[PDB]
Design a protein around this ligand. Sequence first.
Ligand SMILES: [Ca+2]
Ligand SMILES: [Ca+2]
Ligand SMILES: [Ca+2]
Ligand SMILES: [Ca+2]
Ligand SMILES: [Ca+2]
Ligand SMILES: [Ca+2]
Ligand SMILES: [Ca+2]
Ligand SMILES: [Ca+2]
Ligand SMILES: [Ca+2]
Ligand SMILES: [Ca+2]
Lengths: 204, 204, 204, 204, 204
Amino acid sequence: HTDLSGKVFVFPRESVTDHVNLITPLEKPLQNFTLCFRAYSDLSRAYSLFSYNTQGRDNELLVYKERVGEYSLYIGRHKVTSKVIEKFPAPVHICVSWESSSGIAEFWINGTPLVKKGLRQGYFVEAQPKIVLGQEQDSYGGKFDRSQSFVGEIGDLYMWDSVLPPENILSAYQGTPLPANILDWQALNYEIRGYVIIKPLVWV
Amino acid sequence: HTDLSGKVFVFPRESVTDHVNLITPLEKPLQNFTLCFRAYSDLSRAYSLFSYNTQGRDNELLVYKERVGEYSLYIGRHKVTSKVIEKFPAPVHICVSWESSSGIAEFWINGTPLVKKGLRQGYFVEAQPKIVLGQEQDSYGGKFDRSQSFVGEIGDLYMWDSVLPPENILSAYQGTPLPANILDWQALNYEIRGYVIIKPLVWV
Amino acid sequence: HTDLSGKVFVFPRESVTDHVNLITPLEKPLQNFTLCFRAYSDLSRAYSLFSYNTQGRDNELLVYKERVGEYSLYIGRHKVTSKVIEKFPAPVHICVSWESSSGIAEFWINGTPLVKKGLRQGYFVEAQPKIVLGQEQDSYGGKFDRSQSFVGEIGDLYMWDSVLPPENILSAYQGTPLPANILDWQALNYEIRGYVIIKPLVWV
Amino acid sequence: HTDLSGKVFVFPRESVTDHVNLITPLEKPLQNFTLCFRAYSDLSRAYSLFSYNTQGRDNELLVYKERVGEYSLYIGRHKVTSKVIEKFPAPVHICVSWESSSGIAEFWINGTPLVKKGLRQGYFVEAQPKIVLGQEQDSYGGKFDRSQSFVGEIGDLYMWDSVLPPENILSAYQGTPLPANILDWQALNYEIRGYVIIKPLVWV
Amino acid sequence: HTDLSGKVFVFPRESVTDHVNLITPLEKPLQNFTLCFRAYSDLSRAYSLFSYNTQGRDNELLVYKERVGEYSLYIGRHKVTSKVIEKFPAPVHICVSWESSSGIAEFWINGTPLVKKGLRQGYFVEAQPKIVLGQEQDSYGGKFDRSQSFVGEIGDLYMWDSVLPPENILSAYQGTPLPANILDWQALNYEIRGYVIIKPLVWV
Ligand SMILES: [Ca+2]
Ligand SMILES: [Ca+2]
Ligand SMILES: [Ca+2]
Ligand SMILES: [Ca+2]
Ligand SMILES: [Ca+2]
Ligand SMILES: [Ca+2]
Ligand SMILES: [Ca+2]
Ligand SMILES: [Ca+2]
Ligand SMILES: [Ca+2]
Ligand SMILES: [Ca+2]
């Protein structure tokens, strides 16, 4: 495991092949989760921020930016979208949580809550995933799409097997995140494939 | 009755089915009223905020948002509309009052008064209503329209049988409303039908 | 006669009928005047604010709003127009002064001077007027136009027989006007016709 | 001469005749000059601010507003233009300097420097001008153009036979200009022709 | 060498001829560099900011502004572009760094980092350059294009043979740059060709 404190993944160009695999020892299906990270991109087209596929299941858990000010969450192929006022281009801190019992998905942008949406109530997101940054998966670990590639910088990424309350979301945004049990930036297991560079985080 | 202090109804999806029925013992026709509530939605299309129908009477009392920055009140099928500068998307506190003797409708958006309008002077809004949140009624308790459904969050809903002066509107906006005798968020009788989730209010 | 301190006229709907007559015993033709008032409307189309006609003379003294950010003054059928940056919709305090010796017309919007314009130097505005609020006169007391009708609220109307200095205009905008000899909101003689309601001034 | 301290020329209407003649006793060719003045106009079309012609020579020295946010200087018929962010309509302080040896023209808008441009390096602007405010000259003292006429207010006009440094430009903007040897608002020899009115400066 | 502290190069007109040659003792191929400078221009069309060509090689190192809010860097005819929110017209401080080992190019605009891009990883930018300000080269020292010419002002130009950390970039922006070993504004060897004028920097 690697300590990425004060560092980002830079995806410096559009491609079909540049990506990072994120490795997690997750064996049981998810009833709850929270995912937080920082992103800086000047793409205007759609792109994937976080792609999580399982065997035979596309878009099992996908965070997707359709256009400026619009964020989408996919859970088992189904999707919700919430909107926000945002400057472009601008660095952004994104948190998203989902809770099976209610189906409620909560997007938080720069520590500010978006309108709640709901999907897949009672569903469990499948385990044994392939998780990739920089590309959107259409297969278990591949079938990428250049028009959906992420060009820019991603840092401070955390994933918890719980729904973070607002205080913990703000803590993540303001730079003191709670240690995370699925993915943790201070102890990340990753594989760089193609043109991805690790650099200091300079836009915080 | 239920105390919903610090909580909202979440209408997490577009549907023709999801709604909340609000129960009030109202047996006498309304001459005066004030209605306040908090709403958070990222719909750009038109939607119903508060739908009050009686037997044989559509839009007997309706608060309707035609588009961004435009608020409509219907009294006995008749309509008035007032405009406001507002950001989108954004949480909003809406208060609307109507007085039969003058016919004056008073919209207040985030503690700021809109231009007064007037309709149905001398009219009495009928009793024995069915009151719905989440959908727009075209019949007594039903005939909903998907394209008019409310998607998002509503809380701090209060209804008085009198016209509130500005200081009382401001108090409600600030989160310390006067006790209300038709509908009271802190003592609410309601029925959830379909996909509506009660969650803590995190956007104030 | 009537003290309308803290009160306004509400013209709650569009019509060709609803108006307020402003009665004055003015016998001498005016050489100098200043007229101040408060207005709040969300009309986008053109409308008349202050209509002053005499026998056989249309548009003898008219304050006309052609569109957002543009104010017109008519003196003896002749026209001047000055422009201003303003939000819409927004309450506004309008002062306008005219002086025969120079012809100079000064518009003041919310205590800010507009570009001085000029018209009808040497001319005198005829006396024995019919002064109306809420409609545009095309005859001596009548002949109204629906598309020119004022929908909204008017208050703090004052009219002096002299040209007010910048310091005296700012006092009236600040809510402490000097007493006025032609029209005085703190001692006004008026006539309500049609659907016009007096209410408290809530938007200051 | 006349002390015009705290006063403006008001050009109250669009015309082909209303102008002010400015008379300088200098009677010498110009190698260096700085011209500062205050202007307030709500014209959207192009207009002349300062027109300086010599016998047989049109546009010898001309300050010309093309459109909002665009200021032109003509030296001996050659033209430079510089851009600025400005509100419309708004009162403005304009300073412009030109130095023969370098050809450099320096526009200053509200004490803020525009991008330097250069023209007519080594040229001498001709002696014995007819200087006009309110109209654009095409002949020696005349051949005015209605569509180029200045409508609005001009005050605080000063002209030096030197290039003013930033500190001196700022002093003029602030309202404490250095004594001027070509044209001076505190000792100005002027001729009013047509409809031009002297009024106090109120928009500063 | 000249200490150009507090001074700018002014390119006062559009031309195909006016330019400055920048002379450097660098004879070693560059692996790493940082370039910082200040620019003030009101051009809306594309223009070259810094043109660096070698024998037989066009656009070996080029800083190019295609349009408002878009900055392009060329390394060996390969291009990356980054976007920023900026006012127009407005003075700008530009820093750009490039690193061969990673290919990472970093734009900094007024001390704010843009999204990192990547190009020409492993490449060596060729030595013995002709460096021009005011025109874009298409040959070794020439072949200019009027439509790519720079009109406006440039100052505070520095170039280091290393990738500067954020602190040193900010110091340059704030007006305390570190000594620079390729090009240094405080000890610059230059050649003015055509119409270029040295003036004091007034827009800082
Ligand atoms: Ca997919
Ligand atoms: Ca895909
Ligand atoms: Ca209905
Ligand atoms: Ca309906
Ligand atoms: Ca009329
Ligand atoms: Ca009329
Ligand atoms: Ca001319
Ligand atoms: Ca002309
Ligand atoms: Ca080239
Ligand atoms: Ca070229």
